[PDB]
């Protein structure tokens, strides 16, 4: 078991997503990009993802 993000997994369950975001940045830079996330690859990749932020005030 490797702890590449150097943090207890419980820290990724917080209402503050800072921990998850920082670790995800490390994961996506790893090599296979976002393909590392099964759901993204099977349900997001190749779809109109812009739809998920539509109507939002960014």
């Amino acid at each position: 078991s490797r702890n590449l993000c150097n943090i207890p997994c419980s820290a990724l369950l917080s209402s503050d997503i800072t921990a998850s975001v920082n670790c995800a940045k490390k994961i996506v830079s790893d090599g296979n990009g976002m393909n590392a996330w099964v759901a993204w690859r099977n349900r997001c990749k190749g779809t109109d993802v812009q739809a998920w932020i539509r109507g939002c005030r960014l």
Partner: protein, 70 residues
């Protein structure tokens, strides 16, 4: 905490995920949606003994320590 679609989008953009590594914000919100349904407390155990944690379901095999993964 169960985020709102737009609420998470704002949170992620603020943390610099929009266009991070060439992946537009919509990709991240979509991933969070289908991985954890926007719930920061989501957990899921895998057959190899590892568990996925949080809004983005990060795996315990190589990313975080949960004290029970080989």
């Amino acid at each position: 905490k169960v985020f709102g679609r737009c609420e998470l989008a704002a949170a992620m953009k603020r943390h610099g995920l929009d266009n991070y590594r060439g992946y537009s914000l919509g990709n991240w919100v979509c991933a969070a949606k289908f991985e954890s349904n926007f719930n920061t407390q989501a957990t899921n155990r895998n057959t190899d003994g590892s568990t996925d944690y949080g809004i983005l379901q990060i795996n315990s095999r190589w990313w975080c320590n949960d004290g029970r993964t080989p």
